[PDB]
Write a protein that binds this ligand. Structure first.
Ligand SMILES: *CCS(=O)(=O)Nc1ccc2[nH]ncc2c1
Length: 339
């Protein structure tokens, strides 16, 4: 069994010449040479079977990624595991190799307006498909946007994804959430479980703002500090937007704050395209009911050079204990086995 930085990374004779790429969620990511297709590929190692939550997220992602087929969503090319449930300890998922990701790119490279436009188009085109399947990604952020050497973009990491459930979205104030802090919509901290498509649009808005300046727009240091940052830029919500928050703890928290003026987008982003800032404003709307939807964002003047709904496909249908989850992961990966 081949080893990378101390641990087994045992991907049969098909995949050879491994190089470390970085850490994943339940194991490391390597590139390898695929001896069948004659290309380097990415392989992530997953060791989820001790835990309910790890099994859950591994299984959720495999089921989603095998059902989805879209140019802006990372696919699964192969899955490696032992031939029996008893022998199966790790699972390896083989995917297209992508040079970089948007997090790495933003740390090192200024983006032209033409690159920002293209990246945002491809994000929204992929998101149209995800939302058309009644699925929410729920952790969109730069590190989850893979890019290749020609700037093709693919959304990855469906481990926090959920089927949309707007009728069960309401919750109380300061209810814990799992998804990445800087890209969390204000309502998560106020009255939302993150069960609507509007959650993902907020994240895309944050990504757009970050593409404009190379800096996260709302770099909170902790749960309610995230809301401090958002209100610092958007300013105090209007009476109408406040009246939408029926929960009294959440409403009265907002009422307790001193008045904060909106910071104009063109003062934060003096070099940005004005059409990009109009779209940014519509994605970073406080009230999730007023927030632009993915198909409307694609139709925004900023993206007019690329917008083509006939070339922005949708999904053919809506998407629908640890021992049982190991069995389910085993059954779900069976199609990749020899015989
Ligand atoms: C969402 C990215 S990851 O954490 O799953 N790691 C990863 C997957 C697939 C890739 N293809 N090229 C690079 C990577 C990284």
């Amino acid at each position: 069994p081949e080893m990378v930085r101390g641990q087994v990374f045992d991907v049969g004779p098909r995949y050879t010449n491994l190089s470390y790429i970085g850490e994943g969620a339940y194991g490391m990511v390597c590139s390898a040479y695929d001896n069948v297709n004659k290309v380097r590929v990415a392989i992530k190692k997953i060791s989820p079977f001790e835990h309910q939550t790890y099994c859950q997220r591994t299984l959720r992602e495999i089921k989603i990624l095998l059902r989805f087929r879209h140019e802006n969503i990372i696919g699964i090319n192969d899955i490696i595991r032992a031939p029996t449930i008893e022998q199966m300890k790790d699972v390896y998922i083989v995917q297209d190799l992508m040079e970089t990701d948007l997090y790495k790119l933003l740390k090192t490279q200024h983006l032209s307006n033409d690159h920002i436009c293209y990246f945002l188009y491809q994000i929204l085109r992929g998101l149209k498909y995800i939302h058309s399947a009644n699925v929410l990604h729920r952790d969109l952020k730069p590190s989850n946007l893979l890019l290749n050497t020609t700037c093709d973009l693919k959304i990855c990491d469906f481990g926090l994804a959920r089927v949309a459930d707007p009728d069960h979205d309401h919750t109380g104030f300061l209810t814990e959430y799992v998804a990445t802090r800087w890209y969390r919509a204000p309502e998560i901290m106020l009255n939302s479980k993150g069960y609507t498509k509007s959650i993902d649009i907020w994240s895309v808005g944050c990504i757009l703002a970050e593409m404009l300046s190379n800096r996260p727009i709302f770099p909170g240091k902790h749960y309610l500090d995230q809301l401090n940052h958002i209100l610092g830029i958007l300013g105090s919500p209007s009476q109408e937007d406040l009246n939408c928050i029926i929960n009294l703890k959440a409403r009265n928290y907002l009422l307790s704050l001193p008045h904060k003026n909106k910071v104009p987008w063109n003062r934060l982003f003096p070099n940005a395209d004005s059409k990009a800032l109009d779209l940014l404003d519509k994605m970073l709307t406080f009230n999730p009911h007023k927030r632009i939807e993915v198909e409307q964002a694609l139709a925004h003047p900023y993206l007019e050079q690329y917008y083509d709904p006939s070339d922005e496909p949708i999904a053919e249908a809506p998407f629908k204990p640890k021992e049982k989850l190991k069995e389910l992961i085993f059954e779900e990966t069976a199609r990749f086995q020899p015989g």
